[PDB]
Task: structure prediction
Amino acid sequence: KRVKSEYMRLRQLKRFRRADEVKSMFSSNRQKILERTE
Amino acid sequence: YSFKCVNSLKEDHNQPLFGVQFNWHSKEGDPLVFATVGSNRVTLYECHSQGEIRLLQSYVDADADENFYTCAWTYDSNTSHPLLAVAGSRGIIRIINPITMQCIKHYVGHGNAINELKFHPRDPNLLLSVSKDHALRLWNIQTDTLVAIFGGVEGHRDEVLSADYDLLGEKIMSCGMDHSLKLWRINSKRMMNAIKESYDYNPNKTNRPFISQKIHFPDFSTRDIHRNYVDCVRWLGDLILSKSCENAIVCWKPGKMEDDIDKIKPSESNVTILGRFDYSQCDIWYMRFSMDFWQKMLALGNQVGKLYVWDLEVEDPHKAKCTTLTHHKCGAAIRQTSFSRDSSILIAVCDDASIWRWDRLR
Amino acid sequence: RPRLQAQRKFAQSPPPATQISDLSKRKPKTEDFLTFLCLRGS
Result:
């Protein structure tokens, strides 16, 4: 069926917002990386 | 970001090797030393300039037949000598002192082959041993006592493959053939009471056998990520990395993006995937990836002899990176990658008892 | 078929019946094997 079609359709905006947030998460986590590594 | 083949070697027994481990306990300035284990031999080399590598030492076991599997560099708090331990199919764990060129400790408590050895980033007397016995053990290599046995009513059902400390050393992940990935904790009160106890026991003192700790429950788990084997996992700050035979490496976090790592309820039943990484021709299992001590680059061997390299930087995993350094000599396979404390050199083992070397030009 | 193929680890893929001296021939086989006559019992 066309389930995957609408799945990816909504996943467009879902993954847009998700990319924004995970960029924030990348930043935060890389930071802690710096700390602990040092 | 450019390594070049400045040397390549080959053994004589021609039996495939698996292990590559720089000694990441080099007092600043000391020469680069690294080792590699094969069918039933170990090998000691040193990195020299101009793509020179110098044979240093090598031992062998004759009294039986084994295919050594893993190694790990540590030291001695008492006199600061370098320390290397290895283990193979027979399931025994040996501990060798190159300063005297002898083995000083051997451990036998498993039931099958061993698959990996790692140490606690802080404590140097804590050895984690992963086996095929579905049981992940953990020893005090100093007082000669076991501590924990993770596995049981809720453990792994088939041949645990790979594990990885968290960056700080209080959390572990595990992966095995059963598509299953489970979380263990070390920070629990009970656990650290146990450890402190372990550091205190005289057999001559008591008529009692030391009492280990059995743990029958993961902190959290799932099998929804892959639909095939899972054979290498890496902590990423507080994120996760794992590979399968599905020719893609994945990064995720448990629960939801909002879900903290240290609030996770044991009955958690959701995970958050972030991104995927891609490559070609990893259609067999038992192949590992590594990362720099500075957590900025990614290395990975390959089946057909290629390479694939990324950066652990702000490069968005959608289009993070793509770097394939290649040579025309062996395309048998490559098992394992390894960096120095810095990112100077990178070694990898081909499937045909042949070594490679790649010197970086940043 | 894809969900039916087993996964794979690796890739796709004397004449002279001389004497006892054969003993003394065997234990030294390098570094001045004495008596100079054991080589015939190779």
Q: What stands out?
A: Chain C is about 10% helix and 0% strand. The helical segments of chain C are 22-26.
